[PDB]
Enzyme design. Structure first.
Site: not given
Lengths: 8, 477, 92
Positions: B26, B59, B219
């Protein structure tokens, strides 16, 4: 939704 | 006070992940956030393209929190390791992702631990090499969970979403509907394995070390399934990928999605499943799943092939075309293993082969075929499935086909297995017949007015036509 | 028999970098030799190349920064299964 999430 | 998403995955009866390690590929993450502090190890692996700080790690931090966060996580225990393959703009490369996946495999070889789950909260277009690397890593015994993609599009057009052996996860909202945001939203179609909560998901915010933020995306959905998988593998560490996938399907909420949200042709292809944790209630049970092939395409001799995993048995084989221009299907051996093959008709746009793949140890299964006679064949053993194919342009442990068609019966020696056949017919775009609770649909077919095809949806046999009779074969321990 | 692939989504392509994927059973020593061979053959044609990474453990092969002009040459190297142009992935 946040723009860090593509392509929201 | 419980976040809606964490309640949604809580089963109707209830009472982790510590033996398991979850790898995250990520953005950088704020590893000192109190949701995850001491639970995420930053590997400092980094492979990212140049751009073109709160934002740099937003994120990744949120998703680490969805998987393992102490207040709002799915698998509150779980250990995680993070690799950085996305830059501050959330952009990475296929090559960087490959190098990351390779890094995980090398780490494992050097210092073996228990079951590994790898979360890939990212997508690009269809990539042969990325799909192959995922497949190879899955075959090496690592579990991969990926985002379906956020383009309100067919997930088979994206990678790693489209990658064979990877668990691909779409996003549903608080009303259990597929997420849509204008022209954007959850991807769908036959490469999606299941859905999970992925709208308005509260989790760690890298704005401040104790802050939280709601985020949305496939996700976030994939992170719920990674967490659920980590918990399932802690409880039952020996699960093969096929056993884990069958459990995820089996413990999902079923038929809660309105399939009207999906484009018309994708409705039949998209599993109507929303992930949930296994119940406290759990003895051996028969698990089956429906495997749709890729579309055969329009070539006159085109065939579609649906395969099962090595540790599964193919108990039945059906097919479907939208035009109804179809030469049916047959079960054929291949590397000593039965696959479901469907045949396109001359002038047909193509067909799907639809396997029913089941976990049946101690099974000895075979096929009994009769060429065109009406035409009949029986298991002379329990019958688990009937198929029929023809070579013409048009028209009791027993299968019956058209007089001009070959007919194939799947017959298994499976002592301890009881099976029955349930029929239903009506005047009709669709006729439907369901197995009884506690029974598992093994086969679904139409009695031989013009049928498009037949397919199992969970434990319901669906027949599609243009006096049609749906026939379900149902089995249990 | 070696084939070339690049991203169907044109804005997501990243020309100038290629993943050279070798056949399944190829050994690390063979991947390294194949990479060196590409660079030598390219250099004789006046092209600079850079081997960014040699893959082993999942897929054998290498990542190379080079002009796409060299792809016909690269597809003829020993052990090549296929070559893919690098492309973008995005947080979902």
């Amino acid at each position: 939704f946040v723009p860090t999430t593509f392509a929201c | 006070s419980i976040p809606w998403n964490l309640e949604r995955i809580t089963p109707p009866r209830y009472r982790g992940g510590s033996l398991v390690e979850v790898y995250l590929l990520d953005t950088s993450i704020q590893s000192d956030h109190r949701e995850i502090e001491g639970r995420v190890m930053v590997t400092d692996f980094e492979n990212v393209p140049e751009e073109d700080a709160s934002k740099c790690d937003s994120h990744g931090t949120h998703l680490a929190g969805v998987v393992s966060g102490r207040d709002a996580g799915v698998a509150k225990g779980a250990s995680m390791r993070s690799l950085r393959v996305l830059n501050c703009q959330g952009k990475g490369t296929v090559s960087g992702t490959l190098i990351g996946l390779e890094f995980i495999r090398k780490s494992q070889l050097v210092q073996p631990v228990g079951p590994l789950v790898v979360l890939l909260p990212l997508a690009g277009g269809y990539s042969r090499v990325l799909n192959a690397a995922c497949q190879r890593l899955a075959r090496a015994g690592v579990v991969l969970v990926t985002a379906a993609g956020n383009f309100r599009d067919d997930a088979c057009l994206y990678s790693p979403a489209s990658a064979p052996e990877v668990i691909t996860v779409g996003a549903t909202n608080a009303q259990d509907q597929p997420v849509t945001l204008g022209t954007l939203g959850t991807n769908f179609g036959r490469c999606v394995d299941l859905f999970a909560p992925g709208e308005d998901i509260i989790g760690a915010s890298s704005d401040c070390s104790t802050c939280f933020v709601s985020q949305s995306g496939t996700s976030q959905a994939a992170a719920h399934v990674a967490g659920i998988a980590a918990m399932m593998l802690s409880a039952e560490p020996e699960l093969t990928l096929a056993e884990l996938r069958q459990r995820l399907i089996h413990f999902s909420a079923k038929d809660v999605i309105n399939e009207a949200w999906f484009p018309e042709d994708q409705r039949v292809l998209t599993p109507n499943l929303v992930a949930a944790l296994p119940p406290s209630t759990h003895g051996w049970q028969l698990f089956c799943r429906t495997v749709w092939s890729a579309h055969s395409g329009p070539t006159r001799m085109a065939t579609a092939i649906a395969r099962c995993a090595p540790d599964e048995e193919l108990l039945s084989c059906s097919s479907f075309s939208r035009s109804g221009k179809r030469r049916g299907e047959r079960m054929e051996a291949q590397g000593g293993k039965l696959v479901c093959r469907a045949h396109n008709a001359f002038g047909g746009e193509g067909v799907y082969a639809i396997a029913r793949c089941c976990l049946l140890p101690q099974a000895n299964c075979s096929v009994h075929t009769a060429p065109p006679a009406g035409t009949r064949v029986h298991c002379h053993h329990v019958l688990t499935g009937c198929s029929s194919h023809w070579e013409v342009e048009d028209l009791p442990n027993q299968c019956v086909g058209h007089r001009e068609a070959s007919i194939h019966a799947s017959c298994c020696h499976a002592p301890g297995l009881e099976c029955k056949v349930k029929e239903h017919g009506i005047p009709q775009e669709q006729v439907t017949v369901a197995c009884e609770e506690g029974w598992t649909l093994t086969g679904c077919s139409a009695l031989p007015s013009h049928v498009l095809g037949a397919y199992a949806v969970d434990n319901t046999c669906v027949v599609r036509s243009r006096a049609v009779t749906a026939v379900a074969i149902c089995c249990r321990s | 028999t070696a084939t070339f692939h690049r991203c169907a989504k044109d804005p997501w392509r990243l020309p100038g970098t290629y993943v050279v994927v070798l056949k399944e059973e190829t050994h690390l020593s063979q991947s390294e030799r194949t990479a060196r061979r590409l660079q030598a053959q390219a250099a004789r044609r006046g092209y600079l190349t850079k081997i960014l990474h040699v893959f082993h453990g999942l897929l054998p092969g290498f990542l190379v920064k080079m002009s796409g002009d060299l792809l016909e040459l690269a597809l003829k190297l020993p052990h090549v299964d296929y070559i893919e142009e690098d492309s973008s992935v995005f947080a979902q």
